[PDB]
Amino acid sequence: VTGSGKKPWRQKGTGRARSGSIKSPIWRSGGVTFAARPQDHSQKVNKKMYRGALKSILSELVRQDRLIVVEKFSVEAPKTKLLAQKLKDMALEDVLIITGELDENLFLAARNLHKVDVRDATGIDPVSLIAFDKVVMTADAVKQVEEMLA
Amino acid sequence: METIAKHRHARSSAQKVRLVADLIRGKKVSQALDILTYTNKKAAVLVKKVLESAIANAEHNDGADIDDLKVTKIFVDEGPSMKRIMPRAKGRADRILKRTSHITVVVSDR
């Protein structure tokens, strides 16, 4: 805290409580006994505990009928409206899409739809597979996910 | 038909105005003024203006007839204290509060 090093008081003789510092944390201004630093909150996960975890959640998705497998999943022109039409037709709304390759048209069309996300098999993560009502995987997507977890 | 008048931030302590306020509480307004007129207090001058203001509020706006009014409520509250300093011996300083009052007087024909 910005300020001076001088004792305010004569130690003894004045009727006040003894002081050392106008930056003492009991004093108004310049407190903060155990101040914060920038810090790294990240945690370790074992390779195997991560893969094991992905497998458990994916297996539940099957059991709860929230996983949808298809031969292909792609879109023609990069128009969100076009995707929107398709999704209604499939009776999907809040959904994660995992495709075989990072398909760009599909990627562009999905950006403005909040309830829709697109992902290549390489870029999957544990929380996304949970955070959506339905999950769509392409046949190709399965084969890539399968090899990865094995 | 209660009718109010007030002097806010009167320069006297509420304590001192209260002695005089007490002399006219409950009284006929004609009888109250005479009491005030011959009370030897600065505070007798301050509240009397208020009572007279209150009387005039009653005639002009509605009420009227000076005969019917009584001082049915009167209360004197604390205003804010003005802060100053008085030098004492050995470089020691004292606060002085220059205290003020809100004087309220209520009049009604009933």
């Binding site: 004569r10 006040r16 | 802060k83 300093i85 470089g91 020691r92 300083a93 606060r95």
Partner: peptide, 27 residues
């Protein structure tokens, strides 16, 4: 037009020098 007063009530007067000062004891 009743702007707050200067007051000048900063009170750094504390604390002046303080001898007993005083009785003699006790030896």
């Amino acid at each position: 037009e009743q702007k707050l007063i200067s007051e000048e009530d900063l009170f750094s007067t504390p604390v002046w020098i303080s001898q007993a000062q005083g009785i003699r004891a006790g030896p």
